[PDB]
Amino acid sequence: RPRFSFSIAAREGKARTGTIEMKRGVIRTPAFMPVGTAATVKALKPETVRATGADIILGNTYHLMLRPGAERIAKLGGLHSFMGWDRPILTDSGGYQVMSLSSKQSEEGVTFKSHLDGSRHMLSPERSIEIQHLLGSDIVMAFDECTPYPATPSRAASSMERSMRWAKRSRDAFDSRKEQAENAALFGIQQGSVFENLRQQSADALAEIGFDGYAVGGLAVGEGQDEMFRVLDFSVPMLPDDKPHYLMGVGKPDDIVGAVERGIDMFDCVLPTRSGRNGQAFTWDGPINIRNARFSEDLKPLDSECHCAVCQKWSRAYIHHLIRAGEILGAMLMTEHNIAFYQQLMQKIRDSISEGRFSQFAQDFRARYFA
Amino acid sequence: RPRFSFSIAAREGKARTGTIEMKRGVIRTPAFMPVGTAATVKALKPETVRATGADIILGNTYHLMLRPGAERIAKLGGLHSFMGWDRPILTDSGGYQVMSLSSKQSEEGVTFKSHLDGSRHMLSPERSIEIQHLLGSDIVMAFDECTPYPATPSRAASSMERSMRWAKRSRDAFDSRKEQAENAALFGIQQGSVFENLRQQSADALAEIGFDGYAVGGLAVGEGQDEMFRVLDFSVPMLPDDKPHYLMGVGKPDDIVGAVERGIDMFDCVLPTRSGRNGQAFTWDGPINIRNARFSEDLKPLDSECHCAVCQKWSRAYIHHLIRAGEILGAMLMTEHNIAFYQQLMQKIRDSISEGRFSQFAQDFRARYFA
Numbered sequence A, B: 001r002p003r004f005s006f007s008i009a010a011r012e013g014k015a016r017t018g019t020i021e022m023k024r025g026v027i028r029t030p031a032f033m034p035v036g037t038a039a040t041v042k043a044l045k046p047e048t049v050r051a052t053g054a055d056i057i058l059g060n061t062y063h064l065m066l067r068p069g070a071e072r073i074a075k076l077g078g079l080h081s082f083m084g085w086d087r088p089i090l091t092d093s094g095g096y097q098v099m100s101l102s103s104k105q106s107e108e109g110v111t112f113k114s115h116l117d118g119s120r121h122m123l124s125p126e127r128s129i130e131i132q133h134l135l136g137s138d139i140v141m142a143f144d145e146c147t148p149y150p151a152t153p154s155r156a157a158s159s160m161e162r163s164m165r166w167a168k169r170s171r172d173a174f175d176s177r178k179e180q181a182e183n184a185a186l187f188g189i190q191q192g193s194v195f196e197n198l199r200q201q202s203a204d205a206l207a208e209i210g211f212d213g214y215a216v217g218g219l220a221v222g223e224g225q226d227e228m229f230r231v232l233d234f235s236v237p238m239l240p241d242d243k244p245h246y247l248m249g250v251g252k253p254d255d256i257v258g259a260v261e262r263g264i265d266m267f268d269c270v271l272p273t274r275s276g277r278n279g280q281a282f283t284w285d286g287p288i289n290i291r292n293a294r295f296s297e298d299l300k301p302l303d304s305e306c307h308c309a310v311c312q313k314w315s316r317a318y319i320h321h322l323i324r325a326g327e328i329l330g331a332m333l334m335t336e337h338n339i340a341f342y343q344q345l346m347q348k349i350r351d352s353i354s355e356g357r358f359s360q361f362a363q364d365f366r367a368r369y370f371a
């Protein structure tokens, strides 16, 4: 079993489908990664996450370093053993949460106060890589400096250029740790906001360093789908074609389809889990809010085609009751269905690309989903 | 498959072990019934409830008549289909929640305002039985009038005597509904508080009417274990020996053991589910609070002997993290373990009675549990 081997089995336009082979398992691409920020995909046992079709989940350096702690997780045997997920885990590097959740930045790194208890903590390229080593991540993200949306040209350039210097420091720290370099992979993060020249400068710097995969940062932060697709149109071709392309934080089903049409291979977002707990269920006819009174006596499953265990066993009417009553089983069932729906979407994307009918799939998907 | 057949396979002192055969399955006794007040055992799929060893669960007339509604559940196919539990369900009649949760009593019945939205509702012996018919309950409880603890002799007698008249009305309403009389069972509820003469009067009235089983009401309401055991000492022998004896709302593991020693066959309580969500895990060495800092790096399972799936797969340290983080999976894992622990306790009770070593089991259990 290889450390990291990406193979493209089929193409259609800019879209690709294939596999990433890693020591802990195969990742089918395009892939959707359920988010497991606090060492759990919310409301699901790991076996249920696997049963939905997920090949890999996402963890977070920032959250786990605060609770329960990186050294503690390593002492307990690593993140895989701790949470009971034995397949690949990608960990974000913490740069986004430093901006979004915490409350001093320099070239060396960043010091910050935890949002949970105000205790002071430090992150740097070297410390982020070390934390991801302690967690035992399979895909390690380079540590970057993020800037809020909407970013001015000056702030976008400044954070991107520092991110590129930090990408080289992340590369060197990873390569210095033998066990990490032999068993994990390292992805760089392209920045530059909506500005084509900065995206190009960022892509050039990352390719010169060399990574196992390339993420597109700085999207899914409020820009809207038209603008995101515009940025992807020019940004993805700048990345090495022969390595995976990971769009961080995306997204809604239609966002995923359009991003695949633009060359993206990997995705993560909290939408299926978080909005599931809030009562939103994804269906091939668009999302529904199960709390709506129209579902109070609806005996049909959440989605009429979905193969998930929830749709085999429980009605909309029951799940409507559970969510309106605040019952934990409502969160469990909505989340399992939504994650299974996302995996079925990815499976349909992969099959349609492999069969050379992805264009028609995307058209049919949109016509029905937005009808 | 019979409507209702109780068979005692073995005895030791006042303790009994055996089976209740019903159309939807066999109930091994002494039995513990997980509580599923809102058409769910909190945080567990029904298949997980079954995997812990539960033969029967408890639902509630008062809660289900308010949300989602009894006629609605019947229109949707009954409670079993609605929640996905195909085995026996016992439903309490609502008399306790009218007292404990709602906010006018007469000989006919009771009118009350819902605790959820203040809407007005009515309950009576006839309406309670009808609601339990609409739900499709397998074991129907007679509708009683409860009085708060501690009850004066006057209030205990008054509520008991009305309860006995309402027990006859419950019997007649059940017998008038052919489908119910042919497929379900009906239990009476002995009242009389801590007063031996009232317990005797109540037992005499219930036996004259005749029921499939006899519950002991009015305990687990604050009286303490010594007093409860004292009341059981004289109350249980008053009930027909050849029918099941159901102690409502009990209880802690040691309460269950002592009640079995006094002739009780069936139990229900929210303790394993509710306290599980709050961080209390049951072990053979007594309860632990998993949130305590001493468990932060403990790799052992919740209990060293427990056969449940949680103890096969996750450490105390992980569950400690989950509960302290407010994660739903923490509630799921704690609840599964606690319900499995309760079922393993019942299995050890049943086996020890069948083998004529229940006295020694109870002594060994207490010496270790309270060490």
Ligand SMILES: CNc1nc2ccc(NC(=N)N)cc2[nH]1
Pocket (backbone or CB within 6 Å): A092, A093, A094, A095, A096, A141, A144, A146, A189, A216, A217, A218, A219, A220, A221, A248, A249, A250
């Ligand atoms: C919620 N949206 C969302 N977009 C993202 C882009 C990037 C990152 N992380 C990173 N640059 N280390 C996280 C994101 N989260």
Ligand SMILES: CNc1nc2ccc(NC(=N)N)cc2[nH]1
Pocket (backbone or CB within 6 Å): B092, B093, B094, B095, B096, B141, B144, B146, B189, B216, B217, B218, B219, B220, B221, B248, B249, B250
């Ligand atoms: C929580 N304790 C607790 N003791 C109980 C006794 C009786 C009942 N119900 C009834 N008489 N219809 C419920 C109980 N709940």
Ligand SMILES: [Cl-]
Pocket (backbone or CB within 6 Å): A035, A042, A270, A273, A274
């Ligand atoms: Cl989430």
Ligand SMILES: [Cl-]
Pocket (backbone or CB within 6 Å): B035, B042, B270, B273, B274
């Ligand atoms: Cl509960």
Ligand SMILES: [Zn+2]
Pocket (backbone or CB within 6 Å): A302, A303, A306, A307, A308, A309, A310, A311, A312, A337, A338, A340, A341
């Ligand atoms: Zn489904």
Ligand SMILES: [Zn+2]
Pocket (backbone or CB within 6 Å): B302, B303, B306, B307, B308, B309, B310, B311, B312, B337, B338, B340, B341
């Ligand atoms: Zn266990």
